[PDB]
């Protein structure tokens, strides 16, 4: 992913030309959405298609295939973000029992407020 | 040709050879990569021969061969014989030599028209596709 | 850290948003930090705070993404801002790449905040305070004959004056 | 630089005007010094870094920046002073050592501290000619003694760590400049330079030195000159191979042209009744050049330009030529054995690669090689391929083959019996090359002929691994050949899966297999780290330092390899691994290895059993959460395959019973299993029992037992024949056609009539 963006950045860095437009700073999925300046309509369309696939996979109630596609492509940020509205499973009473109270957070109130 | 009229990037001119040349100039007037020998008035000789073969104008093909004197190799006589023979009689030894030349060299050029023309002349395989799979 | 953050919010405000976020991440606050973030326009950090509070899966995923980026050789063009905020999120003070790139977040400020970050983001929450302080000692001392990657506890009036110290 | 100087100057001016705080200036003097150095304010940066050092005497980065600013300005004394202070406060720093060395060299005041920093930088990373040129500029103040000390330090660093290839190259260049051809030749002819012949620049320098030696000393021509020329041509071939493996085309074409010119000159010099090792060397180099031309043709075809499906003919011809080129039969002429071994190894590797490429590109056609030989064996075709390779360059007079005549020379047919020996010989060189191992595994999987992985590991590692043959363990310091084979099968399957996914994403017109330089790396960072840790454990323990991390990675990988902690894995890949282990056990005859394979398969089946119930209940399919594996949806198991998986598990249990010895238990298990493979295994067990009975004495009493065993096996054979006649899918489901069944039936009906 980000092949065209990387090529444009390389051209701008090696020849001072090839980025006569609102360019980006970093190659992160949150950098343009934070700087409020987009880039490449083809990349936006590909991201829209990937989000369509993620929505079709999540609506069915699946997560394994979702993270599989995330690891295959490279957009696991959505799967990493969609894991904050959970809650700890307080059931551990000793050390021999497996640690299952690690998923979730007590800040679900501020999460749903945001 | 009738749709492209006359005053539109060298329109159709009366005569079979002139109509074929006008159709070639309408389709691809620029020199296609993979040119050999010379050209007829700056037009692709291989594409012209392919268009003449596809149209079936054997007299126009003969006219093109007669016009391409120094713009081609030593296969003008073979082209003339292939055009004049309805049963395709251009010497079995010459046909085998052309087939061997096509199987050896003419197998990766950037000229699909020239490749198809050489394949048709040498009588190789049963189907040779280059760039015709496009709703045509 | 309440007094520290309440005297530091007056030194860094709107125009100092980068250093304000850095101080918030080094302190480990949630309430006023998320309030200021949602008042300014920082929704990514507000959404990621809950995922950071517990569950090291997101941290491992971000570390794997950083490793993939270092392998693809894009850190030369990616600014140090995202790298250092990802390092602060993971818990490491200094990150070393395969291209002689050392991204430091400067965790040698206050030993209390350093130990808090090491206990929260660095070490898992299932580690006791004894193991946490042992790991901190191995960090700012030596484990196999390397360099200390932390700070040494000193009196507050002693940190004001400089002393001949090194990375040995 | 990323920010504008004027912009950052305006920013710092606004920051100083909005709140002029000397306390904040002193506390951020380091960042202020960096900003001033970026905006070109040396005095302001120096003042800021001085205030920062005065308020906090920590972090040698401030002293380093102050020394850099002083060096940029002009105060070299204070610059080198701050640099030495920073390097003494810090443990070590390559940049600091280089800066101190260059400052001392510019000041022409040689001291011991600079030499100590240079030695530390060499112990850290002795690469790059910068260290060599700094040592030269430091020791040039003495002269002959300085050069002797430089050579001694270079030799000491090379003995400490073999990584001074560029240093040796620059030393040879300095010798050539100072007119030391004999010393350069003596340094190049060292026995330790054979392992360092993997650098294009070093090999080119060696070739140039040998050419200069030949041009200077030409009055003699004996074994020394022959060895010099042989080493020069070997280095040229290595340059060609490295330039082809690289991602460039221009240098590869230049190296190919140089090699063609050298081969033409060698042929012209040999053409005069010569029967020695020179002819064998020329044949081996011709085969290597043919393989190189085939690789170049494949690379230029796999670039979305020409017809990749039509460019197979010249590559196939070159591979067939390199395969038909024979190998040096022992030693033709004694003397060049040190080079003869490398030549034989390269010939074996070239033959194996050419055979694999031919068998993967022929698409199962045997007449393809004959058609290629018939349609490409003339001067016209030779000139055509030469012009296509060298881009309309090097004609018949420049090529070694253009001067001769082609009369349809016969070639050799690639055979599996020879390819097995070629692979066994190439594994000794591929020892430690995970990419080469994965490539060979993929080639053999595509060829549908899997050699014994036990013999593979035995040929790879000549020694016995530490604490091998372990079924279930929890110690990372105890790997085993079972886990090694499991990991090899897993990485081969994941590479095949990735290649199939890429082919389905791109276009279905992709070739069957791709070379290693085209496939680049066939592993991941964690996989390479685990392979290095396994290699270290085989070569006895790990290196001090990262041994803890290596053991942790080994344990984390073994937790998933030995099916210790269930983290989520697909059943299809595990079933494939179990089938591969069963095939490897059936291919061998050892009892202990077969027992270990059966035990591992039974453990895998018992670990998969709790996962088979989730598929019948219509649940979710697990996936590998570790970044090690890359398996996806290409190897999946549907709901209707649970019965087949249970039948395979029962067959595995019955085979375990048969290998252990409980023949009655294996027989009743196969009888309970309602599969045709179960009846086939029952017939096989009956035939094995009959053979074991017949192997002993055959008087007049065991004949009844032999006859009843023959009848028991003939009953199952007849029922299998009836099932096959009722449904033709029985022969397809059985791993063996009806031909062997009919042969065994005829053998039984012929042996039933015997009377001892």
UniProtKB/Swiss-Prot annotation, chain B:
**Functional description taken from the UniProt entry:** Plays a role in the nuclear pore complex (NPC) assembly and/or maintenance.
Localization of this protein: Nucleus membrane; Nucleus, Nuclear pore complex
Q: Which domain of life is it from?
A: Eukaryota
Residues represented out of the complete protein: 275 to 410 of 820
Official protein name in the record = Nuclear pore complex protein Nup93
Family recorded in the similarity comment: Belongs to the nucleoporin interacting component (NIC) family.
Where does the sequence pass through the membrane? none
């Amino acid at each position: 992913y980000w092949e065209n963006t990387l090529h444009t950045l390389k051209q701008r860095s090696m020849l001072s030309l090839g980025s006569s437009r609102p360019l980006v700073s970093e190659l992160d999925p949150d950098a343009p959405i934070r700087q409020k300046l987009p880039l490449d309509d083809l990349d936006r369309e590909d991201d829209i298609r990937l989000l369509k696939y993620l929505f079709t996979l999540i609506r069915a109630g699946m997560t394994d295939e979702a993270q599989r596609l995330c690891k295959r492509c490279g957009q696991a940020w959505r799967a990493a973000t969609l894991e904050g509205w959970k809650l700890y499973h307080d059931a551990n009473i000793n050390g021999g029992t497996e640690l299952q109270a690690v998923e979730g957070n007590p800040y679900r109130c501020v999460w749903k407020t945001c | 040709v009738f749709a492209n009229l006359q005053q539109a990037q060298l329109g159709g001119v009366p005569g079979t050879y002139n109509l074929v040349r006008s159709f070639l100039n309408i389709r691809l007037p620029t020199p296609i990569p993979g040119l050999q020998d010379g050209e007829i008035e700056g037009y692709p000789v291989w594409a012209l021969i392919y268009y003449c073969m596809r149209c079936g104008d054997l007299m126009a093909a003969q006219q093109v061969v007669n016009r391409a004197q120094h713009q081609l190799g030593d296969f003008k006589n073979c082209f003339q014989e292939y055009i004049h023979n309805k049963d395709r009689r251009l010497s079995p030894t010459t046909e085998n030599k052309l087939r061997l030349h096509y199987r050896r060299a003419v197998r990766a050029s950037t000229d699909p028209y020239k490749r198809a023309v050489y394949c048709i002349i040498g009588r190789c395989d049963v189907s040779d596709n280059h760039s015709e799979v496009a709703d045509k | 850290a309440q007094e520290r953050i309440e005297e530091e919010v007056s030194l860094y405000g709107p125009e100092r948003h980068i250093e304000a976020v850095f101080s918030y991440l080094t302190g480990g606050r949630i309430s006023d930090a998320c309030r200021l973030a949602q008042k300014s326009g920082d929704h990514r950090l507000s959404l990621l705070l809950s995922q950071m509070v517990g569950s090291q899966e997101v941290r491992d995923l971000i570390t794997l993404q950083l490793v993939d980026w270092n392998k693809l050789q894009v850190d030369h063009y990616i600014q140090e801002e995202r790298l250092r905020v990802f390092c602060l999120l993971s818990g490491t003070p200094v990150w070393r790449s395969s291209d002689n790139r050392s991204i430091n977040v400067c965790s040698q400020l206050d030993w209390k905040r350093t130990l808090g970050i090491h206990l929260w983001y660095m070490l898992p929450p299932t580690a006791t305070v004894a193991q946490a302080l042992h790991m901190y000692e191995q960090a700012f001392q030596e484990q196999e004959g390397g360099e200390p990657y932390a700070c040494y506890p000193l009196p507050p009036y002693l940190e004001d004056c400089g002393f001949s110290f090194g990375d040995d | 630089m990323r920010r504008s100087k004027a912009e950052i100057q305006r920013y710092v001016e606004n920051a100083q005007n909005s709140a002029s705080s000397p306390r904040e200036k002193s506390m951020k003097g380091f960042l202020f010094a960096r900003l001033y150095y970026e905006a070109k304010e040396y005095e302001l940066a120096k003042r800021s870094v001085s205030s920062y050092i005065s308020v906090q005497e920590r972090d040698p980065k401030a002293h380093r920046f102050l020394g850099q600013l002083f060096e940029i300005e002009g105060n070299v004394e204070k610059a080198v002073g701050c640099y030495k202070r920073s390097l003494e406060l810090n443990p070590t720093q390559k940049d600091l050592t280089l800066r101190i060395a260059e400052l001392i060299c510019t000041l022409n005041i040689k001291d011991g501290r600079a030499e100590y920093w240079v030695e530390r930088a060499s112990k850290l990373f002795p690469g790059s000619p910068e260290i060599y040129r700094l040592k030269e500029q430091l020791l040039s103040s003495q002269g002959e003694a300085g050069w002797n000390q430089l050579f001694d330090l270079i030799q000491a660093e090379l003995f400490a760590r073999p990584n001074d290839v560029y240093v040796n190259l620059k030393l040879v260049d300095l010798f050539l400049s100072n007119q030391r051809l004999e010393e350069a030749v003596l340094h190049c002819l060292k026995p330790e330079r054979r392992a360092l012949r993997t650098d294009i620049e070093w090999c080119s320098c060696v070739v140039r030195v040998f050419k200069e030696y030949l041009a200077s000393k030409q009055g003699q021509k004996n074994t020394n000159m022959r060895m010099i020329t042989k080493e020069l041509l070997l280095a040229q071939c290595d340059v060609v191979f490295l330039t082809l493996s690289k991602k460039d085309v221009q240098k590869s074409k230049e190296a190919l042209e140089r090699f063609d010119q050298a081969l033409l000159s060698v042929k012209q010099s040999v053409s005069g009744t010569d029967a020695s090792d020179l002819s064998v060397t020329f044949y081996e180099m011709r085969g290597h050049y043919y393989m190189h031309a085939g690789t170049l043709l494949l690379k230029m075809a796999q670039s979305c330009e020409v017809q990749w499906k039509a460019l197979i003919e010249p590559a196939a011809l070159c591979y067939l030529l390199a395969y038909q080129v024979p190998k040096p039969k022992s030693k033709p002429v004694k003397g060049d054995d040190n080079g003869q071994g490398f030549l034989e190894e390269l010939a074996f590797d070239r033959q194996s690669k050419s055979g694999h490429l031919l068998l993967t590109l022929s698409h199962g056609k045997q007449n393809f090689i004959s058609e290629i030989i018939e349609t490409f064996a003339n001067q016209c075709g030779q000139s055509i391929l030469l012009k296509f390779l060298f881009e309309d360059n090097l004609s018949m007079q420049d090529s070694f083959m253009g001067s001769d005549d082609i009369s349809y020379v016969e070639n050799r047919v690639p055979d599996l019996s020879e390819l097995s020996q070629h692979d066994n010989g190439s594994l000794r060189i591929h020892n430690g090359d995970l990419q080469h191992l994965t490539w060979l595994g993929l080639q053999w999987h595509f060829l549908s002929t899997l050699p014994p992985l036990r013999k593979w590991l035995k040929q790879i590692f000549p020694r016995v691994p530490q604490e091998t043959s372990r079924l279930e363990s929890n110690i990372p310091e105890s790997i085993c050949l079972l886990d090694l084979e499991v990991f090899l099968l897993a990485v081969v399957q994941t590479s095949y899966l990735q290649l199939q996914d890429n082919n389905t994403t791109a276009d279905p017109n992709r070739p069957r297999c791709l070379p290693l330089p085209i496939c680049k790396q066939l592993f991941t960072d964690r996989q390479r780290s685990w392979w290095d840790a396994v290699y270290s454990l085989i070569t006895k323990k790990a290196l001090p330092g990262t041994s803890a991390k290596l053991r942790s990675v080994i344990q984390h990988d073994l937790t998933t390899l030995r099916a210790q902690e269930k983290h989520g894995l697909q059943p299809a890949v595990l079933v494939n691994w179990a089938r591969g282990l069963h095939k490897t056990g059936y291919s061998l005859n050892s009892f202990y290895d077969q027992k270990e394979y059966m035990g591992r398969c039974v453990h895998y089946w018992k670990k998969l059993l709790p996962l088979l119930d989730l598929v019948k209940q219509k649940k979710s399919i697990p996936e590998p959460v570790d970044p090690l594996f890359k398996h996806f949806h290409n190897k999946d198991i549907k709901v209707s395959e649970v019965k087949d998986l249970e039948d395979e598990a029962c067959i595995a249990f019955a085979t375990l019973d048969l290998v252990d010895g409980k023949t009655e238990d294996a027989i009743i298990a196969f009888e309970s299993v309602k599969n045709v493979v179960a009846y086939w295994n029952l017939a096989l067990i009956y035939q094995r029992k009959a053979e074991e009975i017949e192997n002993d004495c055959l008087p007049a009493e065991e004949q009844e037992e032999f006859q009843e065993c023959l009848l028991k096996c003939k009953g199952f054979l007849k029922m299998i024949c009836d099932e096959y006649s009722a449904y033709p899918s029985i022969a397809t489901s059985l791993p063996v056609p009806v031909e062997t069944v009919f042969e065994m039936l005829d053998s039984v009906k012929q042996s039933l009539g015997e009377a001892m």
